[PDB]
């Protein structure tokens, strides 16, 4: 099943990346940043520009050709909303192991169709859309996050929001803890990776000693994660989990920036997510400013420091 591809989330120092939308404005900017950073970006696609050169790297007409010629194992998508679902499907059909879709604004119906294909295969793992990407600090960064605030360490972070991840990352570097793997699953309602997908990886990763789960209003993914944690993180060798849930002050029936951030028909409020997570053993930080201190204290209680 599609769950078999969860492992592809754990990018590392061998991950080779192609950029779909490579010659576009944001594809160019973030590829320029990635190359300055030392990332193993090896090429990119723009239909019709195969055989061109860009940032010293080859451009390809198709993901299939790019994959065959470069051995790429991941792709990152900076393709505009009308065509980005097609770009995701192209990567799935080319069996790229990990696809990271940055694009904001893909029609929800388009993503329901993409998910249909995604769920019926297991070669390709999709993160996104409307997400900032994934980083294994010091080994591989795919997406738009600032690498410098990260430090390789002990905390796995999964988040529906990049700005809140940056808070969590800064706070956990300041107190000396660091990050094992950070996954931004993005703000859209229909996407390729949920909290459980990441929790599975974190709970089985020896490098991950604690977890930060960052959520918000909308949907039921946080509640599903709570049930997963009751089943798989409630006995021996459990790991501390800290969470913050955005949207306590959100009014009902309004999309709070993110397409997926809406309290609809009385469902999706923050209070219910906080309570569900608390019942699964999660320490919910009421303030977004206290994620690092909250997880630090949980390490202290378990005698996990110095």
């Amino acid at each position: 099943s599609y769950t078999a591809s969860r492992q592809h989330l754990y990018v590392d120092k061998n991950t080779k990346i192609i950029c779909q939308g490579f010659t576009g404005k944001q594809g160019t900017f973030h590829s320029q940043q990635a190359l300055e950073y030392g990332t193993k970006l090896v090429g990119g696609t723009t239909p019709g520009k195969g055989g061109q050169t860009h940032l010293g790297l080859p451009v390809f007409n198709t993901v299939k050709e790019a994959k065959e010629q470069t051995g790429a194992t991941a792709s990152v998508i900076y393709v505009p909303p009308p065509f980005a679902a097609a770009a995701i499907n192209e990567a799935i059909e080319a069996e790229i192991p990990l696809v990271v879709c940055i694009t904001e604004g893909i029609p929800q119906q388009d993503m329901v169709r993409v998910k249909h294909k995604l769920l019926r295969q297991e070669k390709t793992r999709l993160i996104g859309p409307n997400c900032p990407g994934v980083i294994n600090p010091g080994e591989c960064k795919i997406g738009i996050m600032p690498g410098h605030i990260h430090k390789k360490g002990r905390i796995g972070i999964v988040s529906r929001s990049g700005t809140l991840t940056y808070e969590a990352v800064h706070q956990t570097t300041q107190v000396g803890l660091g990050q094992s793997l950070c996954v931004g699953i993005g703000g859209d309602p229909f996407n390729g990776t949920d909290f459980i997908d990441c929790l599975e990886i974190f709970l089985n990763d020896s490098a991950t000693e604690g977890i930060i789960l960052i959520g918000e209003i909308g949907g039921n993914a946080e509640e599903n994660a709570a049930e997963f944690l009751k089943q798989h993180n409630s006995g021996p060798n459990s790991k501390p989990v800290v969470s913050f849930i955005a949207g306590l002050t959100a009014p009902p029936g309004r999309r709070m920036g993110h397409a997926g951030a809406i309290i609809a028909g009385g469902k999706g409020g923050a209070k219910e997510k906080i309570s569900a997570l608390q019942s699964a053993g999660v320490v919910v930080s009421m303030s977004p400013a206290q994620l690092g201190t909250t997880i630090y204290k949980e390490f202290e209680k378990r005698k996990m420091l110095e």
Partner: protein, 393 residues
Amino acid sequence: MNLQEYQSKKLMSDNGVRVQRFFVADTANEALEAAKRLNAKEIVLKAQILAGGRGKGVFNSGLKGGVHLTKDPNVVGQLAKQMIGYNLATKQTPKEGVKVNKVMVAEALDISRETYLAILMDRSCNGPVLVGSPQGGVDIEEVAASNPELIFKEQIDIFEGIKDSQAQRMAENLGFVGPLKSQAADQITKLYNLFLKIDATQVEVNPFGETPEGQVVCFDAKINFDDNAEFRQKDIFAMDDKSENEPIENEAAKYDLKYIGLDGNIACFVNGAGLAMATCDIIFLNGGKPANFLDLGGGVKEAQVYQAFKLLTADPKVEAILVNIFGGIVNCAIIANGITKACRELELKVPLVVRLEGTNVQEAQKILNNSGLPITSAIDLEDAAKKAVASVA
């Protein structure tokens, strides 16, 4: 976006959904002529505004009631004369009411039975779902509380499309019998295809019901749309009635900013939706009332910061502003100089608290402090919230 009743009912009718016969009129004489064309036993005249409570509303002509029944077309013309061009006030409008430019003149239909039927994408099953209840005419959230056993669902595969077996099963669980069951199944099918065609996030029919004469009719409905599909729904989004939106929200939309007004006096904005929500929250946690949510989107665009100030300096409820910006690769001194520029040119009159993270923060904070403007810097989000709360009296 929102559609007037006549707009959503025409959209449904154009796609094979059965709704009441009606015409739209923008003058009393046109309402008169429309009433005669219906040749109906009973006619309903309805003022077209988005806000609820039209039935108990009052026009500033003095006429009571935005919905009137009559058998006489001449009465339709007379009452329309005291609606069109006047403002209709209801419990859900400002006391000034809403200008009525159009009225619906429709055949009044009796409702023998009421049910609930909605179509949306199921966020747990990845695919459309039909949600229905034989308990129609009420808040579906109330049926789920009182009687969760009266809520029925059919999960649909987006590539297979709706199947007759699914439509018939839902029609039966909604309480339709005999030929009316077959009619309801057909209407469910047409509603499903409509839902996909228009990139709705939800098509909700309440009541979905029957007339004494033996017809299944969508008596009233609410359609919510996917804003992400506007680029392929130009004609529907051109119908968007913005006249009842908060003006600041309409202005923010012109510049691709997502503003949501709240009941408070500490405004804020952030370059990222999650932290934009959490900044509203942390203002509350520290004893304040956030005035708005405002997401600039990820990344740094000085022009969006400028437009954000232009929006907020216009709101008289705003007594303080909290800005949180992560500069990424952009030197924060450039951002800081942009902030002071905006606050000078737009004449900032309220205390501003700024939280910046990125490169060159020390210089940026010095720029803000030497500006001669009511601007203070914060060292983290909690400090920012406490400073913002403490700046209002």
